[PDB]
From a paper:
The SUN protein has an N-terminal nuclear region, crosses the inner nuclear membrane, and then traverses the nuclear lumen (perinuclear space) to position its C-terminal SUN domain immediately below the outer nuclear membrane.
At the centre of the SUN1 α1 coiled-coil structure is a 376-CHHH-379 motif, in which the cysteine residues are at the “a” position of the heptad repeat and are oriented away from the coiled-coil axis.
Numbering used by the authors:
A (entry chain C), C (entry chain B): 361 to 401
B (entry chain A): 361 to 400
Write the structure that this text describes.
Amino acid sequence: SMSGVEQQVASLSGQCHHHGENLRELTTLLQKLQARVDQME
Amino acid sequence: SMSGVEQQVASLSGQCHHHGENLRELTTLLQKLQARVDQM
Amino acid sequence: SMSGVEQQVASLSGQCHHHGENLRELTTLLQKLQARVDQME
């Protein structure tokens, strides 16, 4: 059972990392969209 | 407790999937707003 | 080991929650941008 938890924790860590990289990319795109909107005003 | 840790990991797996759902929703709303800015 | 696994689970739990707070942050900036763009049309 211990080894099964270790493997699922590793799976959760990879998904957690993937979500973190997606957050950073969405943050970049949002900041680019903010600048375009401000330039259009 | 092995069972206890197993239930915590199932909890985190659920929060993970929920976060993944929120990311997809935020991505779709960003694409719609970006298209609205392009149309202007 | 069971305590070592409880800690990694605790690591991940902290990150998940940080991720939630970043999602809420981005949702809010997106909602303010949506309003801003609505005022430009």
